[PDB]
């Protein structure tokens, strides 16, 4: 096997001709390209380039594909070096893959002339002027919907309906109803246009923010339908109307990062709740059995010290009651300490995941 | 192109003559300076110097300006190496730029003989003896001003004016007024001298501590003016007198670092308050709908569990009330946990910014 000597700035690197021909379309392998740098006087290919990098670009030839950056070569000087050597776009994506950088930007505009134009208007708000106008209008509509959900429960507004029941009306006299119907009109129109102008109708019931739009529309329609057509469903439907607060995540990049963080960390949250349940059983049992004898004590059950154990372990506050025996006080100081000890353990994993997803936007 | 071989301690580094002449005023490029080190016996320029550094000083010649320190050469040995090679002050500032070190010390004393001398007396307190005397007097005046703002509201001092209103006086009988006027006299004199002796009068309404001095002077003048010349302005003006506590930041280097930290981290604080508002709506709605049926419960509105949700999520304390149902207790333990989970997420960014600005004084 004949040998080839390449001299990158005085540093002689040597290899067998077979190794650099494994990849033949590359700069060193291609006979013609490499011929330019060759110097016939000393039988060596002189190049003037970074010394620490050309070591990694000979490993790729001798290892059938692996591309790993030396830890003392900065990213920019390496990216340029794969380019001069002509290792190919497959190679540079693998280098990006080894530095683990997200590479997905797939935006298939339909390109049917009108479907594409209105999709550009309604999806990407930075594109135009009316796109930012539509973003501002949607955020203000969501905000007044939240304000109607909370101000409908205030006793001051309902002064004349505050009478015993034994004595959503379409009478259009209640102002909360007509402003609520205007909000649901806007949500329905916006969702139907985003359905009919999308470039992928099969994938539309896959994105989670679309399923947030649907479950925000639903309960007003089923209460209107059953009203102009139950008592178990009504208390559930009145609390599925709180999900319009999560429909404010299409316009925020902080709520979307908290959704990625809470998806990618479910094992840690399960460990958090499991450790809490263990500690609550243990400490509530010990305080019940160390304070039951005292005639002036208040713990009357083991499933009655649970709330005391929860608010003492999480350093919140009072509990239902407070220990009055010397023994209850020793099991209450151990409970206070063990609480922060057992809830601070899985939290650094969660904040590290957030910090990663928070800087990956950059 | 003729080639030049430089031998730094046995390690042969080689390059084309054109590369080291790109920068001609430098040590290697200048023919005469480099001629001293040259040894005609072996046609190589022997130098005895650090091996890991001379690699980076050949990249600068071959890369048109980039200067990056290898990660295994300590700062001091590199700083000296750019000096021996004679790369120029433009080069050494760029090296300081790449280690990101603050380089701004612009103090334009006016140099008009008297304006410069009294500016040195009043601005830089370490310069003299009377400068530290003036610093000590200003700090003591600020402290007794805070003490007058709080002791003017104590019911014990105002025993004889505690009568019904239907029955800032310049009568000079109230001792709080005359000591207050002495404090505002000192603030006004000090600010007017720092105006008339400054070397840049156009930039004087740009520094934030100067605008703190002005908004600390203002409300005493407008209440004196309107008194010897409203009922909406009076309750606002009585609370803009609390900014004399921030006028104590010219004499502290910890308050100035907290101001830099809170300026450079506003996106994180916005994310903190946004996450809190989301959690407060969600958990207050769930505890209102899981405890309303019980006839002995106390949550009468969704905008009535907001304070309970805030003080439970931030692990402070009681709340307006406490859950009495099994369902309220499950939505109250989840609220306690999710509070610390959603407020501990943006905080490491803020403490990292503080730690950076806190050690950059060194």
């Amino acid at each position, epitope marked *: 096997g004949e040998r080839v000597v390449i001299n990158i700035s005085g540093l002689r690197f040597e290899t067998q001709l077979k190794t650099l021909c494994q990849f033949p379309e590359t700069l060193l392998g291609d006979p013609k390209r490499r011929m330019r740098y060759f110097d016939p006087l000393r039988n060596e290919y002189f190049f003037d380039r970074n010394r620490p990098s050309f070591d990694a670009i000979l490993y790729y030839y001798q290892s059938g594909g692996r591309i790993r950056r030396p830890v003392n070569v900065p990213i920019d000087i390496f990216s340029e070096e794969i380019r001069f050597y002509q290792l190919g776009e497959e190679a540079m994506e693998k280098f990006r893959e080894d530095e683990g950088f997200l590479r997905e930007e797939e935006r298939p505009l339909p390109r049917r002339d009108f479907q594409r134009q209105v999709w550009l208007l309604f999806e990407y708000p930075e594109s135009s002027g009316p796109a930012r106008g539509i973003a501002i209008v949607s955020v203000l509509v969501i905000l007044i919907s939240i304000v109607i959900f909370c101000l409908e429960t205030l*006793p001051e507004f309902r002064d004349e309906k*505050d*009478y*015993p*029941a034994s004595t959503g009306a379409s009478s259009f006299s209640d102002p909360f109803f007509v402003v609520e119907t205007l909000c649901i009109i806007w949500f329905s129109f916006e969702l139907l246009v985003r359905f009919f102008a999308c470039p992928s109708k099969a994938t539309f019931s896959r994105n989670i923010m679309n399923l947030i739009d649907i479950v925000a529309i639903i309960p007003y329609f089923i209460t209107l339908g059953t009203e102009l057509a139950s008592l178990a469903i009504l208390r559930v439907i009145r609390l599925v109307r709180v999900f319009r607060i999560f429909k404010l995540s299409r316009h925020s990049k902080g709520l979307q990062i908290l959704g990625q963080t809470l998806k990618a960390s479910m094992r840690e949250l399960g460990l958090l709740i499991f450790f809490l349940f263990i500690g609550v059983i243990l400490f509530s049992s010990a305080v019940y059995f160390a304070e039951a004898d005292d005639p002036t004590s208040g713990f009357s059950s083991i499933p009655d010290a649970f709330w005391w154990a929860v608010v003492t372990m999480t350093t919140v506050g009072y509990g239902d009651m407070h220990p009055v025996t010397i023994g209850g006080k020793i099991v209450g100081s151990l409970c206070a300490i063990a609480g922060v000890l057992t809830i601070a353990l899985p939290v650094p994993v969660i904040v590290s995941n957030f910090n990663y997803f928070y800087h990956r936007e950059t | 192109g003729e080639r030049v071989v430089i031998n730094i301690s046995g390690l042969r580094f080689e390059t084309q003559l054109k590369t080291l002449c790109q920068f001609p005023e430098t040590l290697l490029g200048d023919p005469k300076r480099r001629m001293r080190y040259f040894d005609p016996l072996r046609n190589e320029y022997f130098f005895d110097r650090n091996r890991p550094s001379f690699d980076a000083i050949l990249y600068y010649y071959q890369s048109g300006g980039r200067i990056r320190r290898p990660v295994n050469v300590p700062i001091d040995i590199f700083s000296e190496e750019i000096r021996f090679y004679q790369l120029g002050e433009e080069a050494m500032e760029k090296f300081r730029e790449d280690e990101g070190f603050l380089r701004e010390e612009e103090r334009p004393l006016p140099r008009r003989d008297f304006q410069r001398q009294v500016w040195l007396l009043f601005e830089y307190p370490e310069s003299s003896g009377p400068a530290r005397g003036i610093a000590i007097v200003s700090v003591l005046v600020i402290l007794i001003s805070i003490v007058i703002f709080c002791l003017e509201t104590l019911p014990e001092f105002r025993d004889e004016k505690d009568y019904p209103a239907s029955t800032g006086a310049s009568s000079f009988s109230d001792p709080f007024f005359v000591v207050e006027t002495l404090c505002i006299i000192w603030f006004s004199f000090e600010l007017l001298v720092r105006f008339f002796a400054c070397p840049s009068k156009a930039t004087f309404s740009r520094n934030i501590m100067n605008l703190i001095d002005i908004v600390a002077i203002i409300p005493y003048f407008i209440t004196l003016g309107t008194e010897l010349a409203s009922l909406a302005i009076l309750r606002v003006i009585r609370l803009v007198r609390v900014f004399r506590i921030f006028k104590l930041s010219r004499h502290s280097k910890g308050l100035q670092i907290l101001g830099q930290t809170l300026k450079a981290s506003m996106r994180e604080l916005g994310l903190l308050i946004f996450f809190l508002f989301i959690g407060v709506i969600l958990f207050s709605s769930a505890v209102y709908f899981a405890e309303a*049926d019980d*006839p*002995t*419960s*106390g949550f009468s509105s969704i905008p009535d569990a907001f304070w309970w949700a805030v003080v439970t999520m931030t692990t402070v304390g009681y709340g307006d009330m406490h859950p009495v149902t099994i369902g309220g207790k499950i939505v109250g333990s989840l609220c306690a946990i999710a509070g610390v989970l959603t407020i501990a997420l943006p905080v490491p960014v803020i403490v990292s910014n503080f730690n950076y600005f806190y050690h950059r004084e060194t």
Partner: nanobody, 115 residues
């Protein structure tokens, strides 16, 4: 589980003065709206008084200025002070406390008939 018991009834003559009381357990009145309802013989119940939680008192036209409804806010007690009773009053009375949209509770009844 909850109960609304009341007393103070009987018969009275013209120009009388009396005070029915409503008490309960299983239901703090500090937290719920309450009122007194009467049912004249022959028609449906009408309202004597209402004290919506928060101290807002309203009365019907017939009892205006002759009746007062007060929650001692202690002892889970609501007391009505009727005054100068007239023969049109003759009726059977009832007590109540409710939360709009959730629950409604009644008393057993206790009558006051004016001679």
């Amino acid at each position: 589980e909850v109960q609304l018991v009341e007393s103070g009834g009987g018969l009275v003559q013209a120009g009388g003065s009396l005070g029915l009381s409503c008490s309960a357990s299983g239901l703090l009145f500090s937290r719920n709206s309450a009122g007194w309802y009467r049912q004249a013989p022959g028609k449906q119940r009408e309202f004597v008084a209402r004290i919506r939680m928060g101290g807002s008192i309203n009365y019907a036209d017939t009892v205006k200025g002759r009746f007062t409804i007060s929650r001692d806010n202690a002892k889970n007690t609501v007391y009505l002070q009727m005054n100068s009773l007239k023969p049109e009053d003759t009726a059977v009375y009832y007590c109540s406390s409710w939360r709009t949209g959730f629950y409604e509770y009644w008393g057993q009844g206790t009558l006051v008939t004016v001679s």
